[PDB]
Structures are given as structure tokens and as C-alpha cells.
């Protein structure tokens, strides 16, 4: 249950998310649920005049945005990228998860 976290947007879809973050500062982010899909979360982040979106995959016992860095929970994953730039897995996205969208 992540509803307490200022970065958690619940079941928000892409259009709403884009419309919301496009007006925010680079580094503003949210995690949203994708109930229908095999990847049931996405991270969305404002970066250099665009809103970028990253699939969060659950496979076997773990959760990840890249199979090269696997976590035991969504919270651990989010807290990792709060302090470690996304660029270690996406060049062209050199920012941390810097500002939760509700902050």
C-alpha cells in the first residue's frame, strides 16, 4: 500500500500524467499503476522539456526497470533511484527521482 507516498499516483493513465508533469520542473516524478498489464507500474518523469515513461517489471521474485538491477520491492526500487541517477540504465535520462509530484 503506497497511497501514503507523495510520489504515488495510483491508477493515473498516460494522458493525465503527461498533462500534469509537463508543467513541472525537470526531475518531477510519479509512480502509477497499470492494472491491465504484465508490467503493473510505470515511472513517469519530467526531464528536459519532455515527460518520459519507464515500465516497472515484476519477474520471478523481483521488481526492476532493468534486469541488471533487481529489487525485492517497489519501495526499494524507488528509494534507489531517488539517490542514484537513472543514467546508469538510460543514458539520455540523467536525473534522479528528485521531486515527488505531490510535493
Amino acid at each position: 500500500d503506497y497511497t501514503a507516498y507523495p510520489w504515488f499516483a495510483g491508477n493515473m493513465e498516460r494522458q493525465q500524467t503527461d498533462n500534469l508533469l509537463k508543467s513541472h520542473a525537470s526531475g518531477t516524478y510519479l509512480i502509477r499503476e497499470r492494472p491491465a498489464e504484465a508490467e503493473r507500474f510505470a515511472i513517469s518523469i519530467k526531464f528536459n522539456d519532455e515527460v518520459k515513461h519507464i515500465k516497472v517489471v515484476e519477474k520471478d521474485n523481483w521488481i526492476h526497470i532493468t534486469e541488471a538491477k533487481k529489487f525485492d520491492s517497489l519501495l526499494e526500487l524507488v528509494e534507489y533511484y531517488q539517490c542514484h541517477s537513472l543514467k546508469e540504465s538510460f543514458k539520455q535520462l540523467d536525473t534522479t527521482l528528485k521531486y515527488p509530484y505531490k510535493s
Binding site: 518520459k52 515513461h53 519507464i54 515500465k55 532493468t66 534486469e67 538510460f90 543514458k91 535520462l93
Partner: peptide, 8 residues
């Protein structure tokens, strides 16, 4: 142009 960031 991909909808979600491509993982290299």
C-alpha cells in the same frame, strides 16, 4: 519515439 524508455 518509443512509448516507454528502451532499456539498452
Amino acid at each position: 519515439p518509443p512509448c516507454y524508455m528502451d532499456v539498452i
